[PDB]
Amino acid sequence: SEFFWDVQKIQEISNVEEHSVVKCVTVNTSRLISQLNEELQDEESGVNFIVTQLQLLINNVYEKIQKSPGVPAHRSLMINLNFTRLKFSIAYWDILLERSLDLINGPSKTGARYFITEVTPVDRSRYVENNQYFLAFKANQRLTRNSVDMDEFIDFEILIKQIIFDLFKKNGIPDQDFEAILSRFHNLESLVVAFNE
Amino acid sequence: ENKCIAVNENKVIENQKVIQSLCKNSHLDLIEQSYFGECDFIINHSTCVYKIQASRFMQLRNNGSLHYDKAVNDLLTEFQRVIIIVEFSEIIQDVDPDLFWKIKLYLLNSRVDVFFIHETTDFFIDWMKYFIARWAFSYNDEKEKNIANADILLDLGFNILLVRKIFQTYSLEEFFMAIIKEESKAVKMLTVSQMTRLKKLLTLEW
């Protein structure tokens, strides 16, 4: 019914992940927290209040970021809801944030990802650029996504022979014709197309 | 319409209390599978769930990487969605609250969902039911009748639900043909790495 968050400022964490933009939003939760303990008798009743407050925050913060001269463009937008105080366990916040996102259908759900953390004095943009293990993890991530370890699989030739004999069997092709046909089409791509088009 | 997920053969006993609860659902089939990956469960053709410990995240392997580095990168080869469940002791939130954002930034990726949970079984059971309800499927249709053709997809390393999902819409040949024509429905079933493995198979010249 009212906005109990105090959204203080929006900053970028500059060097997280090349295909995403990461925004860090400092939210003062003191006002929200005093609503809970002062005026909420039961957990069930308070859960629904937090969910509602979370949808208000998500909508407010997404909207603010879209008016601000920051072009997500092709890159994924991830929004870090950085709470001055969590009060309860991060694990309940992760549940409640996911459940709140599950109810929203507007653009703030489909246009961004969110996660909650607690404010600390440590500078995170410095950490991301100083941490070598992090750098090594991303380089290895892209190397493994764009490479195939062929040893982990069995010989492709075994599979190709299987498909060939099936096609030939399927399409009424005698052994005395195998040679001419394999000399016309030089891989499964050509062979399969020649049989279905 | 019985929804179906797969459990990693190596993590059954670790997850045996989870499994006992999930299987109370008379509308869920849990298939034990041997598959590439350290993930505990496979929710659908391209979604896995992988439980790690926050307390081990910064331990160094002999080859200089961090504990879960290669496991996570391997899963990103086979799953469009890699869900990471991070068990942590509640004490961390008071004694070491920087670990939460470090882990989430370290793993930050549009194909990776990271959720912190306490070390209790209830938490993992409840997330699992949430994941089943949101992302699992039944696989009642079958346009491929020859089991050897399924062996072909299995030998390419496709998990059994990716095979069932493919064989829901295509026979093997149709799937080959639809990938060769880059029809989007076939292409979007696969990761980049699965797509390149397959093109190698279709492109190798005798």
Side-chain angles (χ1 to χ4, degrees):
Chain A
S1 55
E2 176 192 357
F3 197 86
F4 287 103
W5 318 92
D6 292 293
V7 176
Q8 275 181 21
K9 64 173 157 183
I10 304 174
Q11 321 168 340
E12 186 186 5
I13 322 281
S14 279
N15 293 308
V16 192
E17 150 58 342
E18 303 269 339
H19 315 287
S20 42
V21 182
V22 182
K23 309 246 118 161
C24 185
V25 178
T26 307
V27 189
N28 190 102
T29 60
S30 58
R31 284 174 63 222
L32 185 113
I33 292 172
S34 64
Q35 271 307 293
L36 278 175
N37 37 28
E38 281 197 354
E39 307 205 5
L40 291 188
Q41 295 303 49
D42 251 342
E43 196 196 74
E44 300 174 21
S45 322
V47 157
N48 292 118
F49 165 69
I50 292 162
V51 172
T52 303
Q53 287 309 300
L54 271 168
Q55 294 163 345
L56 282 176
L57 189 70
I58 291 158
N59 288 348
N60 181 264
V61 164
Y62 183 86
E63 177 160 359
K64 194 165 177 183
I65 291 177
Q66 293 299 311
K67 67 179 170 184
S68 289
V71 167
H74 288 262
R75 284 164 205 174
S76 283
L77 174 65
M78 353 270 296
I79 298 168
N80 167 203
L81 295 181
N82 203 23
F83 286 2
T84 53
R85 193 175 143 209
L86 294 169
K87 190 204 163 62
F88 20 110
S89 176
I90 190 66
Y92 300 132
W93 280 114
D94 278 17
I95 290 165
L96 293 176
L97 182 55
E98 192 76 3
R99 172 184 178 183
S100 299
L101 288 172
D102 257 21
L103 306 155
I104 299 166
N105 304 293
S108 69
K109 166 189 172 68
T110 78
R113 293 150 68 68
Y114 305 76
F115 55 104
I116 296 168
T117 56
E118 186 160 78
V119 177
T120 87
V122 183
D123 178 301
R124 311 179 175 180
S125 28
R126 283 308 306 173
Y127 176 89
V128 158
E129 59 188 90
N130 284 317
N131 191 315
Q132 286 289 290
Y133 299 111
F134 183 46
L135 285 54
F137 174 67
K138 291 155 69 190
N140 278 306
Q141 190 167 110
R142 39 175 49 190
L143 287 176
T144 67
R145 163 171 82 263
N146 298 319
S147 65
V148 179
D149 186 350
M150 297 283 298
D151 298 3
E152 310 174 30
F153 310 90
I154 58 148
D155 289 333
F156 274 78
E157 291 141 29
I158 287 153
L159 306 187
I160 290 160
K161 277 139 83 193
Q162 293 193 20
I163 296 158
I164 290 165
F165 290 122
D166 286 20
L167 294 177
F168 288 171
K169 175 69 176 168
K170 223 203 183 219
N171 284 288
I173 290 185
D175 304 338
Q176 62 167 0
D177 281 13
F178 287 8
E179 177 179 291
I181 290 191
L182 295 176
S183 302
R184 295 184 69 196
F185 312 108
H186 317 290
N187 58 20
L188 283 176
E189 199 167 280
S190 303
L191 190 56
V192 174
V193 162
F195 276 142
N196 297 264
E197 278 183 7
Chain B
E1 299 201 352
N2 214 351
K3 276 171 192 167
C4 177
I5 70 181
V7 70
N8 188 317
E9 193 181 21
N10 298 135
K11 298 209 181 193
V12 168
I13 295 162
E14 305 156 34
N15 289 296
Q16 64 176 14
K17 288 187 182 189
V18 180
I19 297 186
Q20 197 271 338
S21 260
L22 291 184
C23 274
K24 288 159 158 185
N25 184 340
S26 80
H27 299 122
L28 178 81
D29 306 323
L30 283 210
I31 303 183
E32 186 173 301
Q33 277 302 8
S34 156
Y35 53 68
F36 178 69
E38 290 288 316
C39 59
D40 302 63
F41 295 96
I42 293 182
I43 300 303
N44 71 17
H45 54 287
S46 208
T47 296
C48 71
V49 172
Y50 184 30
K51 192 169 81 177
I52 75 190
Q53 325 301 127
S55 71
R56 294 165 81 180
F57 195 82
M58 302 300 301
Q59 291 171 5
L60 320 166
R61 295 227 179 268
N62 292 318
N63 84 315
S65 61
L66 297 183
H67 206 254
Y68 299 105
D69 277 354
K70 190 208 183 247
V72 170
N73 287 339
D74 287 353
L75 296 178
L76 285 173
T77 289
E78 295 297 309
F79 303 102
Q80 287 164 358
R81 186 183 294 118
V82 170
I83 297 169
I84 307 280
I85 293 299
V86 185
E87 301 190 316
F88 72 103
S89 162
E90 293 172 359
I91 307 179
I92 280 177
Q93 185 159 323
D94 294 305
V95 174
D96 188 20
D98 288 293
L99 190 53
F100 299 127
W101 68 258
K102 290 188 215 204
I103 289 176
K104 269 173 189 169
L105 286 187
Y106 190 107
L107 299 179
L108 189 59
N109 181 317
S110 70
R111 295 161 62 199
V112 182
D113 305 333
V114 185
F115 307 115
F116 287 102
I117 73 165
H118 300 154
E119 294 148 322
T120 73
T121 299
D122 274 327
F123 262 89
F124 193 44
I125 290 167
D126 294 326
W127 273 110
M128 280 298 297
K129 298 180 182 208
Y130 173 77
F131 297 137
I132 294 170
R134 176 170 180 186
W135 283 313
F137 290 106
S138 67
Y139 305 88
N140 274 323
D141 256 354
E142 292 184 5
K143 310 233 162 180
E144 170 60 59
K145 288 110 182 188
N146 182 339
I147 195 173
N149 284 345
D151 290 353
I152 283 154
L153 292 191
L154 291 175
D155 290 336
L156 287 179
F158 291 9
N159 76 74
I160 179 188
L161 302 178
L162 171 49
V163 173
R164 292 181 182 189
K165 176 62 164 194
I166 293 160
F167 287 159
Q168 266 210 162
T169 294
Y170 307 98
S171 68
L172 187 60
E173 254 191 277
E174 297 174 64
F175 177 68
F176 287 166
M177 273 298 300
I179 286 296
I180 297 175
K181 298 288 176 163
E182 310 175 275
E183 303 186 352
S184 84
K185 190 180 166 72
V187 168
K188 287 180 186 184
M189 288 176 174
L190 310 180
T191 64
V192 175
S193 178
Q194 285 159 346
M195 189 73 187
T196 86
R197 274 212 303 280
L198 195 69
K199 239 171 271 174
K200 275 185 179 168
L201 174 82
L202 302 172
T203 245
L204 184 21
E205 307 186 344
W206 43 79

